[model samples]
Target: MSKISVTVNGRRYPWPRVPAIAVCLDGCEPAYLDAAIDAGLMPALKRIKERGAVRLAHSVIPSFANPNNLSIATGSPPAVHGICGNYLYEPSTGEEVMMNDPKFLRAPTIFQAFYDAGARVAVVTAKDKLRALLGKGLRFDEGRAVCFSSEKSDKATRAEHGIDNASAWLGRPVPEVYSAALSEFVFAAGVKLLREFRPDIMYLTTTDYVQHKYAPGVPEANSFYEMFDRYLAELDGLGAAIVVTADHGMKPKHKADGSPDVIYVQDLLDEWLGKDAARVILPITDPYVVHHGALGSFATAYLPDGCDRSEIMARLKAIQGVDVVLGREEACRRFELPEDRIGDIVLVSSENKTLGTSEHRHDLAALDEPLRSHGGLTEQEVPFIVNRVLPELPNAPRLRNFDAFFYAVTAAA
Candidate 1:
């Protein structure tokens, strides 16, 4: 009569009658959590921590949503999962493309293992683009698997989903795609499903629009955090093991002139090396361009044949705001990234700067406010918290946000 379990590293563990939930607060920096707690804005979160545990965890390198989210889902690093960023360059096609397809994944996800073990799996995300990748290799036709996004609520159907219209079911209109309403819609939907179906495992992911537009202590951001705490209170009432974490952190990357403080990597490379000597691709590029305009603190450079690698490395490190520059093998070895998916050379920026390809390629006009972006050392810090106490592992290796679900369901937590 009881069937609930967790699978980590292809091994199944006994966890009967234990339903677990994971929440990914996209772009939640540690500073935001500290400020909110100090300001008494997150009573529910603070109380949960008081009863349980909270730790500052490190996120994977090239700290973008796609790579880190996949890392969390699979409980592995980018080397095993093969997703290094939101965008990737296909050497076969000679073009850079968004990494939204599951075909790019090289490892199995926790959802697939749970689904295979006869447990109901439900996944809800803010953006529809992540639904496909997050729900990969699952049998949705069996009525035990449900995956949907707030961005495209109209696509929900009675056959595909238990309900036909999520907007009507929630007694509200569908929220705008580029607003905080979208994240709220995701949380509301998750609560409704948790009350009704009570799935064995659920993954709820939100958007970063508010984090990109407003600072942590501002009214816009404070309101969102308070609303999030209220939802956490409801989830705590559901009696399921809950784990809260984030994919990456947010940072301001603008100057006093209201212009983005950017390092045009491609322009500088071309100015030094001849034209077309290298191709710089921003892996942060995606459909949601309003928040960051496809500019971030991480980028990849593919060098042409007969290019001087040592000279390019020297020039890159000498530039202001440029952080670390690594070659293919070294980057793969250091960051645990897949060599095939990474470029010949990788460029990382400081906390206060962003990297881009060209002036015309980025949509600077779309950013009315100061630019806030991620994907560097500053964004690698995130909050890892659980609503219950956890037991120590035999080895007690350092825990990452990716280990939340595994520890939540498998241990006493």
Candidate 2:
């Protein structure tokens, strides 16, 4: 009854040998791939690289997660999917919506594609980002996805519970939970799930969290790679063709003194917008600024009650930290954003800085502790990697987004 049987750590799994796909999501560098091989941690990956795994070249995202992950799942660009950044600018409402919320996804995802095409698919993650990409209550005829996200704080025990729960829900054991030092114990639990489920497709999202908190490039990241190697060894023994990649690369922010070197938007706002306008938006960090709805965007004011947009634009233009105040049409065109989804007066920042919203206040604040942000179209934000499990189709090198690739998975299903 099974297409492939992979046995690991003395446990036998009735599943596809090549179903195992590993992803180093959210700012993981290509170096991890090389390190993974050199360390001999991912035996399956090493064997594939030794054989004929195509090292296909790809470009980084404009610099963000929602867009990049959406790019992978849909094989489409930000413009098409409308997820240009982690926050969406609503022209009519002048509201900045967080992309991590499931309500914001207008297009379908790779998982949905497979579900539509009639196949079993499962996605596992530590955050609710996937829920934003893939809608909640996504149902196929046979399978369901397991999302282990914490609205409060991230915990290994919580994740362990998610794995156990997902296994029970799927009526199969999950292959394994691969993690760094903090999550090594959790990874053991995930391995248990993998052994039980032996799924046809296992999409893994890990790395960025621990790498960002403890070691951007230090020994901590190496520790994560070490654990990854152990998991790879177990998966390899099962003959599960492994594919590893990330959503973005990491960079150091603090200077030698350790004082935050980034500019505070408050300073710029105070200098240009006068104290009154400055009150509308508060300084989040040097890299991000949060604006209120009353003083949100020019477009938001021009509603049914006869809101004046032109005056608001002129006022915003004169404000400090304000890049350019463009009309809705102009803003979307300038940034290549999803048409009709952005604000009337677009707020662009200087340096690699950006503006975020308090829409998902709970999670946004939780994830924004560091100035190391994503969402803009920066070279370091997108993910690119090579793997053998996924066949090199006709347009392997030229595949820009996730649509074509997801379409293939649908077809395969």
Q: Which of the numbered candidates is closest to the native, going by highest TM-score?
A: 1
Q: Which candidate is the best by lDDT?
A: 1
C-alpha lDDT (0 to 100) for residue 45 of candidate 2: 53
Residue 412, candidate 1: Cα error in Å is 5.8
The whole-model lDDT of each prediction reads 0.80, 0.44
Summarize candidate 1's per-residue lDDT along 98-190 as a digit string, tens digits.
Answer: 788889888888888888888777788889888778878777567787777888776776565445777777766778988988999888888
Candidate 1 root-mean-square deviation in Å: 2.8
In model 2, state the lDDT of residue 194: 58
Q: How well is each residue in 1-413 modelled by candidate 2, as lDDT tens digits?
A: 53533332222334332454444355565565566556555565566556523343232234444556656554455565666555554444546556567666666665555444443455555444554364343463343443343221132222322233433443334333223432343344345445765545555554355654543334666567666667756755565445444555544333355322233333333455443232222211211543111111111112222446666567666755445566657656654456555433455433334443223231122333334433223324223333443454323235332422332222223
Candidate 2: residue 138 Cα off by (Å) = 2.3
Model 2 residue runs over 4 Å out of place are 1-24, 35-44, 52-62, 85-98, 132-137, 140-164, 167-195, 214-217, 240-242, 265-270, 273-336, 343-383, 389-413
